[PDB]
Subunit: 390 residues, 4 copies
Amino acid sequence: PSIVIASAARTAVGSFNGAFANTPAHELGATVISAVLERAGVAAGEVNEVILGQVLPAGEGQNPARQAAMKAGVPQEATAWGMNQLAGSGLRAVALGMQQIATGDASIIVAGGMESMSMAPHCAHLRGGVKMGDFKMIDTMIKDGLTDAFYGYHMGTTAENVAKQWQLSRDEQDAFAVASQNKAEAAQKDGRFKDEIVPFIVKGRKGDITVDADEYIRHGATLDSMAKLRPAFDKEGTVTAGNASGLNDGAAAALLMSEAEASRRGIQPLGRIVSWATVGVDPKVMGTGPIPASRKALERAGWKIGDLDLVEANEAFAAQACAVNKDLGWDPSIVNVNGGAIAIGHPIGASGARILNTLLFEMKRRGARKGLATLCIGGGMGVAMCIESL
Amino acid sequence: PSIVIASAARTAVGSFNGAFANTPAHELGATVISAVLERAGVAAGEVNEVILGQVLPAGEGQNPARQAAMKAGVPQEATAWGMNQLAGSGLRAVALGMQQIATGDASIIVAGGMESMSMAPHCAHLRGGVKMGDFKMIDTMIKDGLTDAFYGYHMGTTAENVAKQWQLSRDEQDAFAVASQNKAEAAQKDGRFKDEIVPFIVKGRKGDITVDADEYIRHGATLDSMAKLRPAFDKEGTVTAGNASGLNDGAAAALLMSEAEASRRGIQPLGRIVSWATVGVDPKVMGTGPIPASRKALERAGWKIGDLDLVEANEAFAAQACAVNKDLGWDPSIVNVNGGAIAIGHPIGASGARILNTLLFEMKRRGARKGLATLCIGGGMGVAMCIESL
Amino acid sequence: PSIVIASAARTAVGSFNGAFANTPAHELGATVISAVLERAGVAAGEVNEVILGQVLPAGEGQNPARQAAMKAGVPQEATAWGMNQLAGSGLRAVALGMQQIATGDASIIVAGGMESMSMAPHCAHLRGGVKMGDFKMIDTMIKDGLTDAFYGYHMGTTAENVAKQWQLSRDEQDAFAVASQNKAEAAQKDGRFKDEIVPFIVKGRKGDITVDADEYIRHGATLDSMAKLRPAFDKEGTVTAGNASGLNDGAAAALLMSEAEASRRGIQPLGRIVSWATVGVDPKVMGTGPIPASRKALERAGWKIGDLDLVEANEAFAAQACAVNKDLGWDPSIVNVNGGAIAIGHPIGASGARILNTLLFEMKRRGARKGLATLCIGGGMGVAMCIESL
Amino acid sequence: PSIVIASAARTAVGSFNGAFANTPAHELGATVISAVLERAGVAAGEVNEVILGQVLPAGEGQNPARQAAMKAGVPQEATAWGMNQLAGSGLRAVALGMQQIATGDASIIVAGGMESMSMAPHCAHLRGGVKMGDFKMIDTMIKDGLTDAFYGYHMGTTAENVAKQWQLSRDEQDAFAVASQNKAEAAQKDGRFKDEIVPFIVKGRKGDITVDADEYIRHGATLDSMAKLRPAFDKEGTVTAGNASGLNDGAAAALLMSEAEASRRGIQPLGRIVSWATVGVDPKVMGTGPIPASRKALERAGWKIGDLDLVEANEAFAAQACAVNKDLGWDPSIVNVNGGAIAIGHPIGASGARILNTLLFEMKRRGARKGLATLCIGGGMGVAMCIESL
Ligand SMILES: CC(=O)SCCNC(=O)CCNC(=O)[C@H](O)C(C)(C)COP(=O)(O)OP(=O)(O)OC[C@H]1O[C@@H](n2cnc3c(N)ncnc32)[C@H](O)[C@@H]1OP(=O)(O)O
Ligand SMILES: CC(=O)SCCNC(=O)CCNC(=O)[C@H](O)C(C)(C)COP(=O)(O)OP(=O)(O)OC[C@H]1O[C@@H](n2cnc3c(N)ncnc32)[C@H](O)[C@@H]1OP(=O)(O)O
Ligand SMILES: CC(=O)SCCNC(=O)CCNC(=O)[C@H](O)C(C)(C)COP(=O)(O)OP(=O)(O)OC[C@H]1O[C@@H](n2cnc3c(N)ncnc32)[C@H](O)[C@@H]1OP(=O)(O)O
Ligand SMILES: CC(=O)SCCNC(=O)CCNC(=O)[C@H](O)C(C)(C)COP(=O)(O)OP(=O)(O)OC[C@H]1O[C@@H](n2cnc3c(N)ncnc32)[C@H](O)[C@@H]1OP(=O)(O)O
């Protein structure tokens, strides 16, 4: 089996309670679904299944993947499901879809992720009844997204642990963050994100608004402004809101089919999926996940690390990002060339399809042959995928 | 590629706010994961991944499937993820596991489902705030489990749609339900759930309790107690509390590996998976999903309906189940031989694994060579899987 | 001016989530208003104002006093208002009614209090929105009723403060508590609450229930059952659920007019109000409020402590009740002759009026000439009223 | 007894979720208490009681009036209590305060009201429990403040009832409303609210903000702006957001003592309370309440309507204000000379004190000898107070 990405698309990443503050994930989803269909010239009638990574579905109704697909125009006869491996989710969905094709179960799959961290509700278990006493309304975004289920503290605390292990100074984390911002503002301005982004129309009462730019990138980001910030978790620590990514909203998708199918339709694919791997690590240092993941995927692809021409490695925190780069030893000048999530944002279930978008379109534009996408995963996991240009 | 269910276990299904009223899904999940390992004689450290269907994860912490796997002693090295195709989630998880092993990405998978409908919280989106006026706190079990996203109404209203299209009377669904209650009562007393069920220890403060029996089945179920119930959804309707399944809690799972590996380990498998399928249908008549999904599966196995020795066809509603039997035309004496969900319970994300567990242990008990398991899915889909004993 | 109490009534006192669990305070209020009118031979058309103490009006609608008055058939031309001096409220309401008559602003007032602790809601401020992080749903009963606003701790902690300053042992508190129960039981069995109580009909769907007995009084209370309880507020503390009053529902009221008006009508009044007083104390030892208030009220009446024939002093906690008795030195045999709040219950806003009811019917029964009613108030206050028989 | 108002003060009236959006009512209250004291040259140690009207206390903690008094430095020996007769509260507190002094129960009282509509929580009764389905989180400001308890509709509907009975056109209402804005604007710019307002410091993390000006008054209000609005309550109705008052925060108070005590201390009082009255009306036309109350107060004073030099009549709705003016026949040019609540706001429990404040400082400024303050009250009441200058 030879499976290709025929097309891909993503929304802009919206800031917490910004452009997409009242926009449900399945609407962002539906827009990306329509985009990948139109970009490859495949009708929505020909899609067999839609697979979407989503971490925070509380309150959005039955199977939001099926809602995304129906709104996109996919017919009732196809199928649609969601899945959750946290930040890994959106890239893992892409691997799952490839498997559907490889085992002769489907011809054409749309896979990716969607998230609205904005729209995540607060909740409380209330059936028994609260006879006496205050009770907590729990923020589901914090509880289901950002808190370790075993140790009970924030993901940023695991970033703290990774920093300590690898002895990464505050100045090393800030300098990395300022580079990711500077790279991102540069790509934005030079038009390097227009290709991958499909504009979203936010319908309203007193006017439609078109959103086509990443609103979380901060312009003119400087080391001095990074150095002014207070530590955000450990009170004499090194992780801040400046060297960690944010809470964001968006969606992203790819259309997969067999190489042969693409050639029958005259489609020029963005890449062939050569290998993928998922691996587990200690949850206290979950940011190490991408290391055994990226190395296992490379092993499956039969490739050496120096064979890679481009990498996209999710930047949840500057700490885990510096460490991952240090261990694997690949050339920093080929990693996150258009910036990473510290700058662009981290819409969790979507992020893995997001970075895959960035990779595929950058690989197309510089003529790169081989690349890899990798992310760390809360609870101690990593996921990775190798991509080769045709 | 030939993939087999080495082993399988489920919990008793508990009634709503009943035995597992304060038990999170991942604990019921950890208990079945450990039982599949034990029953097979496989060490937890040999498990590559745990895949669990779960529909209602709100408030349960990051990646509940990872929480289940970790409490069951599966090492940190392994991976876990959750997925949602509503009531088909648990069956689909098994197929996804199968796929992991057939694409050469894994050796040993634990797959199934888990659900606590009792532990599901109420929620509201409150980030923008509520400037003025009343607002609703939403039941996430109804909103995310039992309400159609497209038309707005309860799943029982779809069952009513199918009762009118297939012209099924209230005496025909009442007859169906009592028969299911009688079949499930006779099975329980006969000892025929003992093998599949693993006891679960409810940890309390004033005493542990060991749950090893389904508590939702009602004994001595009469047609008159059925015929004295007012309709739940349509006031001139046929669907009532008694001819529809309940709200339940439980978990259900299966250990997957290749046939060659089952033989190297000296494991005699419960069955070989031969084909599966999912298909979509008109959401208004979602209960019909199992018709095309069973047909596609049966065709992907090269089988005729006639070949089948045993079928488990989830009874969400008597209306949908009466209708599926009518269209397919298999012998109703080989369907849900030990009762159905009307009797037993319908723990949504878990139900598809549940009915697989009953199918496998019954097929072994009687000596049946071929089995089909199938379920309808909210939003309008079906899933099915063909099993063959060795 | 001389103001009399022409008539008085109270409902039975309901247990927390017991007989009155779903009855709003204003329906209790209305039954008592009707009763005081009937008992005096005064028509509702003659009432000028209704004044009701009430601590916990949240969720009850606009001005519950007006709702109570209107339901009892008091004409729209009358006025009605609520007030809050915490447990002082129902007694203060009577002094405020007496003031409207003394200043010539009204002729006939109904005053007292009403409280539904069971029907108190939980609440949160949600207008600004909750951008990120958990929030508490606050129990309004605990927050508005039972928590000190200055120090942040439960009223039971101020009882601990008093026990420590007055060196009152757990043994002494428990004996006081068991004596309260035993006196209240005896009084109930002997019929001594019959006169003061007006029966309340709790309307239902499957039948009405009449409630005319205090349900919180525990029959056969033992010293062993007080002695086994654990401290409720301080782990080396002495105050327990046994030697504190409970959380309760009820209403109580009195009909006030000038002495000259009672004589024109041919009414035999229950008592003349001779004096009242309210004084502040340190919040930390609020249970001491009755000391300065009783002494002030006695000064104003021109009476010595030894002149009193009967005293009702509210027993919020055994600790403060004991301290009050010690400081004042009145003969304990004339205090709370029929038990107090430890046994009967403490429906906050109604209690001041409840104990006045008990005092007036007992004075009448035994022919006592001079009486005092007093209560402590959260936030550090005391209220007292001197009554003389005619 | 002759009782005088020695001094008075109010905060600026804040807009809904505006300047006081996170300021509890008791904080606003404490500032006004300190101000009346400072203005009269009376020490906090001399105050016997504080009486504060307040409609919406839910969530604020035990007895907010005590909390306000304590914050202002009134000694623990003094007493404090809240009351609620709706928009009547803040004026009625003054009359209650006058009564304490007239019956010789106190010498120095601070009386007024406070309200934070912004801080009013949402609530639900959750004790019994919510077994299944959605439930309502009720806005306490609307339920307890603005909804009639007998008919279930907004106060705005009662305004429509009045407009209908009195045949008041939309253009007459919109003219009154624009006049009220234009008079308030003029008075604000001329500095006529300076004397009555005490500045409130809103303590902020990143800077304090001093609030000394009424923020709800619209500058340059046009008739065309009123004329374009949609009816707010009845779809062919006449009452709009423009010709109704708003939802607002504020506090207001007066220091009261005997005329002879003022003389001893050398205080030139703002006024002598000559009479007061409260009367009920039909709830359906509650806006007519000022008519019978103002006539009763004038009767009790021995004054004809034409003896009055200045009137303050609260403007809940233009409709009722117009009705009141037409029935009473007072010269409209002496009524609400500096604008009314349509322009300044309506902080419910504080409103009656706010209008008293305005009346006293205007009477002083122009040398008017005879004044009257009156307001309508939800549930069908009126309150009125007559003042004479010394
Ligand atoms: C495997 C995984 O994927 S784990 C990853 C999952 N995602 C996460 O864990 C998210 C991690 N981040 C978070 O949880 C949150 O965004 C936090 C806690 C770090 C920050 O949240 P907040 O406390 O609300 O920080 P916020 O975004 O407001 O920033 C704080 C201040 O720093 C400023 N700031 C941040 N970055 C910069 C910068 N580069 N330059 C200058 N100023 C900056 C902001 O403007 C802000 O100022 P303000 O509050 O006066 O307006
Ligand atoms: C794709 C899919 O899978 S769609 C399927 C998804 N599943 C569902 O939608 C679940 C459908 N069922 C439901 O929603 C609910 O069970 C309902 C609304 C139908 C009824 O449940 P509830 O409203 O919570 O009521 P409850 O479970 O307490 O039972 C109601 C009454 O019927 C009685 N009852 C129900 N069945 C029977 C029976 N077979 N014999 C005798 N009595 C019965 C109960 O004992 C109870 O009686 P009571 O009022 O005298 O105490
Ligand atoms: C000025 C003023 O007014 S301040 C006063 C205001 N009012 C108050 O502060 C009320 C004080 N009391 C309270 O707040 C509460 O009732 C508390 C916290 C003390 C106890 O509340 P709860 O959690 O409902 O405890 P609860 O009433 O169920 O009692 C606990 C146990 O003690 C037992 N108990 C209580 N009294 C007795 C007794 N006399 N004999 C035997 N057992 C007893 C109960 O039966 C119960 O037993 P269980 O746990 O085995 O079932
Ligand atoms: C006896 C008694 O005391 S009963 C009195 C008790 N109080 C009440 O009953 C309160 C009555 N008022 C209310 O309930 C509310 O203020 C309402 C329902 C009338 C309006 O409230 P809201 O829903 O928040 O509407 P809002 O105040 O935003 O006004 C709506 C629009 O009209 C506009 N508007 C308001 N006043 C004016 C004006 N004078 N000129 C021009 N436009 C105006 C606003 O700017 C707003 O425009 P926008 O939303 O595009 O920015």
